[PDB]
């Protein structure tokens, strides 16, 4: 059960400067020591996961397997919930361990088993006849898991699709490190309305979770919430998914 909706022609991934973004706290006593960080004025590769053109059909799919190189900086700017979670691992195959952050409506379930992925991850939604609400059961992403080693559950990382101010834009940020066999994640939710561009001003990201997965990480891919486009009379679709990806360096 897998589909090839991610076909496209080569697309030049744009770039933009990053103004003092992604700075986070290494200790536990001060807020508001060399480590990996994103240098000021660095280049961040801007993407378009789902894009339209010409007839304005959402034909331009993409979710390439970026290289997890010395950590990653991640961020999105939108007013929706299309981007759910991430896949991390060495080879994304049914022969070595891997990680899954499968965010869903009320919880975030971090899982690490021997997943057998397809050529692309989906995590879509559809409708269930017997009850009268949509369902998000998505065995599509990983097909099966032979032998597992870890599990987890907690309140979801991402804030709700709050939509409190329509004249604003939600700028979610993240930072992922696998330093010394410990998986570390930060976060920060920030209100912005001015422009799509990453804004001036410090953010001071803060810790979220730390788990002892003990895995090697080289390839990471992002997941989206593609809802079944029940044909009014293809297959799946969504609206305007985008994000940013910089890289860390041992610099300091």
């Amino acid at each position, epitope marked *: 059960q897998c589909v090839n909706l991610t076909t496209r022609t080569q697309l030049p991934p744009a770039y933009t400067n990053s103004f003092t973004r992604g700075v986070y706290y290494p200790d536990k006593v001060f807020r508001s020591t060399q480590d990996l960080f994103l240098p000021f004025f660095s280049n961040v590769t801007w993407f378009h996961a789902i894009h339209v053109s010409g007839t304005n059909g959402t034909k331009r799919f993409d979710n390439p397997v970026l290289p997890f190189n010395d950590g990653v900086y991640f961020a999105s700017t939108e007013k929706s919930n299309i981007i759910r979670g991430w896949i991390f691992g060495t080879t994304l195959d049914s022969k070595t361990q891997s990680l899954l952050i499968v965010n869903n409506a009320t919880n975030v379930v971090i899982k690490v088993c021997e997943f057998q992925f397809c050529n692309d991850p989906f995590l879509g939604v559809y*409708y269930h*006849k*017997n009850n009268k609400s*949509w369902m998000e059961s998505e065995f599509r992403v990983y097909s099966s898991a032979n032998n597992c080693t870890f599990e987890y559950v907690s309140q979801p990382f991402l804030m709700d699709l709050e939509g409190k101010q329509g004249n604003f834009k939600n700028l979610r940020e993240f930072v992922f490190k696998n330093i010394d066999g410990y998986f570390k994640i930060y976060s920060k939710h920030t209100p912005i309305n001015l422009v799509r561009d990453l804004p001036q001003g410090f953010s001071a990201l803060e810790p979220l979770v730390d788990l002892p997965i003990g895995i090697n990480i080289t390839r990471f891919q992002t997941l989206l919430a593609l*809802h079944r486009s*029940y*044909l009014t*009379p293809s297959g799946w679709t969504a609206g305007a998914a985008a994000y940013y990806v910089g890289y860390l360096q041992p610099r300091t």
Partner: antibody
Amino acid sequence: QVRVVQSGAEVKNPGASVKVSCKVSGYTLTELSIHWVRQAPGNGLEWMGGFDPEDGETIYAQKFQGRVTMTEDTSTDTAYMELSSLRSDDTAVYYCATAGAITGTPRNFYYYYGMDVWGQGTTVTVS
Amino acid sequence: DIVMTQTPLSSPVTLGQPASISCRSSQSLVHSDGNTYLSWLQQRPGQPPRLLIYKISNRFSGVPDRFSGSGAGTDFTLKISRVEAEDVGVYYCMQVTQFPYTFGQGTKLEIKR
């Protein structure tokens, strides 16, 4: 989109029930409602019953109350309908019927689509 | 109760000219949504019927173009700007709203000259 296959050409003797299936390829059986219809030879069709998408139930026509049981099993995706007490003279063609809901996830309205795609049909053979 | 009957007994026609047919009921078909729901069917010999229309003012995809109907009132009609030989078969009109969902009476269509 969707492909529906059925077979009911099993040659048997009068005095028992009959089972009819509808293999659904494409939309999962939990996504598309189903209905049923009968058309005797030299006679027009006739609506019997089907799923009520807004009521979550399957309601028969008054003519067929208590005569036939219709169920489905998403593990096999074969919508079953066992029509009881058939004989040779009652052999005829039986068809499937399917449809779903129209609006997207943040929907704006329900839909009574009725039926739009049909199976190949099959003569329920009794003799 | 809601019935569905078409005025003509049979509809023998000739190649190339337009055609029309009427369907009549005992009650209205407007839905509680405000929008009325109506459909039309076409059947070729030895084949299951195909839905040609699924609302008073639409037609189904895949079916030939120029297939149209009178999308208003309660005596809706099925009309085409042309007719062909392979279209030989029968036709029906169906309702949606009335959940008893009775099946109307069709009308034979034939090629004559």
